[model samples]
Target chain A: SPPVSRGLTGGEIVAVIFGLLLGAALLLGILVFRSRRA
Target chain B: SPPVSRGLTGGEIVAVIFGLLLGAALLLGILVFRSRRA
Candidate 1:
């Protein structure tokens, strides 16, 4: 790998945050699809 | 219906954004699942 990188870039932070929330939403969709309170 | 809807609440915004990304990821995942470069 290329040095493993360090710290966090703005884009990386945003991406992680975006993905994190997206994961939450995916869970929500599963709940909604199952007719549960999301 | 109950007067449609307008604007977005904080939670609503999060929900929308969340769903948007999850939708995107779902598409990407499908592509990957089908053996394409997703």
Candidate 2:
């Protein structure tokens, strides 16, 4: 059967977690750069 | 010195980090929900 649950598969979980971490890092870096440019 | 350094202040750093984390979480959550609806 297809995935019909509330949990995430391995790939999905990784995608979410990794994306979250990466996004956080990227935003933080951008903010710092902007501030530095001021 | 007029705050002309290469580092971020405490408030700035927090703002960046918090915004980053929140944005990431929001994006990922949206994606997952979209996937689930499929």
Candidate 3:
């Protein structure tokens, strides 16, 4: 079986969410920086 | 005897990074949301 249906838990889900959030923050920050420059 | 000094491995480190990233995104997003509202 795969990790998701077999052993995946809240921990993994949260980790994925965090990674996405960090990327989002970086992108948002970049956007702000660019807007200021423009 | 501890989880980090001897046990904290690549997986744990990655998880921590993810959690931090998600938190960052949430905070940045909230800031943007509030500014727009204000």
Candidate 4:
């Protein structure tokens, strides 16, 4: 088994931050839209 | 000036993710609500 790498590089950190935020935003947008219209 | 830290620890990554998601959710919820009621 490979050694555990517990640190995140700069790119990884940025990717995680943006990716999560974008996904959350899209999900929230959809939910709010559906609830508003229904 | 302090030296640049180019990596994130596990706790930092987790904190960033949840904090960003929570803030985004709150902001989006408020925006949707205000727009819906306006």
Q: What TM-score should be assigned to candidate 3?
A: 0.39
List ranges where model 3 is wrong by over 4 Å: A1-38, B1-5, B36-38
Flag the better candidate by TM-score, 1 or 2: 2
Q: What share of the true interface contacts does candidate 1 keep?
A: 0.03
Cα RMSD to the true fold for all candidates:
12.5, 17.8, 8.8, 9.6
Tens-place lDDT digits, model 1, residues A4-26: 24343333444446655676556
Strongest candidate by TM-score: 2
Q: Highest lDDT among the candidates is held by which one?
A: 3
Residue range A1-38, candidate 3, lDDT tens digits: 24433344444566556666666767667877976745
Residue pairs with backbone atoms closer than 3 Å in model 3 (clashes)? A18-B22, A22-B21
Cα deviation of A26, candidate 3, in Å: 16
Higher-scoring candidate on DockQ, 2 or 3: 3
The deviation in Å at residue A14 for candidate 2 is: 0.3
Lowest summed lDDT over 10 consecutive residues: which window, candidate 4 chain A?
A1-10
- CAPRI tier of model 3: incorrect
Between 2 and 4, whose lDDT is larger? 4
Query: DockQ of every model listed?
Result: 0.05, 0.08, 0.20, 0.12
Candidate 2 reaches a DockQ of 0.08
lDDT on C-alpha atoms for all candidate structures: 0.51, 0.52, 0.61, 0.60
* Higher-ranked by lDDT: 2 or 3: 3
Pairs of colliding residues, candidate 2? none
